[PDB]
Amino acid sequence: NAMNTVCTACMATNRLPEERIDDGAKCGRCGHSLFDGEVINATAETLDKLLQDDLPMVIDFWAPWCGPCRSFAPIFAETAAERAGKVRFVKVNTEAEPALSTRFRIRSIPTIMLYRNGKMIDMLNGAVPKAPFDNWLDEQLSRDP
Ligand SMILES: [Zn+2]
Prior knowledge:
Distance between the termini: 17 Å
CATH topology of the largest domain: Glutaredoxin
Number of domains: 2
Keywords: Structural Genomics, Energy metabolism, oxidoreductase
Largest sheet: 5 strands, mixed
Strand content: 15-25%
CATH architecture of the largest domain: 3-Layer(aba) Sandwich
PDB class: oxidoreductase
Bound molecules: zinc ion
Name: Putative thioredoxin-like protein
Shape: globular
Entry title: Crystal Structure of Thioredoxin 2 from Yersinia pestis
Strand order of the largest sheet: 3-5-4-6-7
Order of helices and strands: EEEHEHEHEEH
Assembly: monomeric
């Protein structure tokens, strides 16, 4: 069976086998590693294209000068690297991207939201340490669609 994933560099859709031999796949338009484990900073122009990915996608809605946002950031990044082939990690600076923040009706920061196949699966209210963050992800991903 096939699935679609989005090139985090050029936004191209790339069709891949659901069951992969490795994670070395490269974007067919631009050569970019499809699974580089890097956090992605989304804007009003990229977010919706990113949501077309069939990979699970966790989104951190944050702001500058926000203590829990600061402490969550490195945890978000490190987790991102550990799951390069399974989950994409996206960040939205609510102050850079006010229309996005309004559209997603963000009521606290940070807000951490998991999206799967266009569905909003669950959100965390605030920052958490890495282990409870890893547990939350695993639990939500093992959940039935
Ligand atoms: Zn590309």
